[PDB]
Design a protein around this nucleic acid. Structure first.
Lengths: 261, 261
DNA sequence: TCGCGAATTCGCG
DNA sequence: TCGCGAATTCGCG
């Protein structure tokens, strides 16, 4: 990055800014970097917007809505930039989900499970809900060439390295990262087609098979692989990175503004 | 359909065959209709299969697996047909999910909610998990031109018509189908791009925008709109319909078998 | 064994 | 108000 965002990142760290809060800080860092462009933060998108976006592509799409006031509310929020035609182009969506209380259970003393006897709780499947907002915003962005969706993981269910947690009574309980009674990371990798976890997959990829050539929209799935809490500074720099990439993809529709104002 | 499947459907009804069980009955009805083709029922697909399918399309795909023995287990199962090159082409995947106990609560007497006072329970978001298996099998079928995924809904959270349920003490509690404290149908419509609920969306649609032309894989979302339980016969005929369509799309790779054996 | 699936109650603004 | 989001325990084979 550049120097100015090193200042913003320390501010995030100094305050432990939550994902929505860091998302706002990113909107602020960008409007500080591109003073001639207009940025906006939004905390929800209602299904009518999505449908109207869908119909603009093919008139058989976006045709259903049972609850009128139905909406999508990513807990990190949406950031958008206004292009050269008055349209609002999304540059960042972010989420931060949690699963697996194990490490806190065996840092102090608590045996869990059906009869208070297990060291580990067998992980559940709740984190699968994240695929909805991904297909909602992917449909919303079905006519774009980028997809700035950032999902942050935290908890014992998303480890990528073996960690050992010592009980109060000294007993060192040991978490093996590839244990399919804890690790639920594989429940997410359909969202980016098995491409690299912990990387920037913002620019859309076009594959083929027959008379095809088709676009893939891949979520950026970042995990805190060791079980610790996310560092607000890193969270910032990643979101700023995904953002700037979105801007590079949007360049053609941003020229006249940046070059005149 | 034809006459023979009217017999099979009554058999399903006579026994209240669950979705996996009806899926088996469909595999049996098809091999009874196409005696020269080989069909197979499967009750899971493990992530290695999916990844290997992904890599066959683009070598950057399918690259992650944290738990080796990780798998996908749709509660309806997978049916496949063997094509002219020894490959197994999936013709049916089915699921049947449930949400919303309301109607049974107010058929007999039970006030729910935080202090045992509410007639309705405010619906939760668990049904969003279904988007994972949809993106798993869609990636699995990323090189196909059809997508035979059938999701069946049941419960108070998926109504499409206003129903009134009389309490034991005569009091007629009234369920309004578009109430966004009950209806969670809108949580599913990202899976078929707002195309018609309760229809056969098996054959893949190709839209565009710029230098594009891209394929859409749309789930077939069937709801029992009035709150009742599914009729096993209907479940059968729908799954048989989706199946036969899959076969029409696979025709070119099935010719030599059907025309010789 | 190891792993996938069930859906639930309710806080929030 | 109406509606979206939190993730959890544990059965199963």
């Amino acid at each position: 990055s550049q120097g100015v965002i090193g200042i913003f990142g320390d501010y995030a760290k100094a305050h432990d800014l939550a994902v929505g809060e860091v998302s706002k800080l990113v909107k602020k860092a960008l409007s500080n970097e591109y003073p001639q462009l207009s940025f906006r933060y939004r905390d929800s998108i209602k299904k009518t917007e999505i449908n109207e976006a869908l119909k603009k592509i093919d008139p058989d799409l976006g045709g259903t809505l049972f609850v009128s006031n139905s909406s999508i509310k990513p807990d990190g929020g949406i950031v958008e930039v206004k292009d050269d035609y008055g349209e609002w182009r999304v540059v960042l969506v972010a989420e931060a989900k949690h699963q697996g209380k194990d490490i806190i259970n065996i840092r102090n003393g608590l045996l869990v499970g059906k009869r208070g006897d297990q060291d580990l709780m067998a992980a559940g499947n709740a984190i699968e809900k994240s695929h909805k907002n991904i297909s909602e915003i992917a449909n919303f962005m079905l006519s774009e060439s980028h997809f700035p969706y950032v999902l942050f993981l935290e908890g014992s269910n998303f480890l990528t390295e073996n960690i050992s947690i010592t009980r109060p009574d000294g007993r060192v309980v040991n978490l093996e990262y590839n244990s399919g009674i804890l690790n639920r990371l594989d429940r997410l990798t359909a969202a980016n087609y098995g491409m690299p976890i912990n990387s920037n997959l913002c620019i859309n990829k076009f594959v083929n098979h027959k008379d095809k050539s088709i676009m893939l929209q891949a979520a950026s799935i970042y995990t805190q692989g060791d079980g610790r809490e996310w560092d607000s500074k890193i969270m910032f720099e990643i979101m700023f990175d995904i953002s700037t990439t979105s801007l590079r993809v949007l360049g053609r529709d941003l020229f006249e503004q940046l070059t005149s104002k």
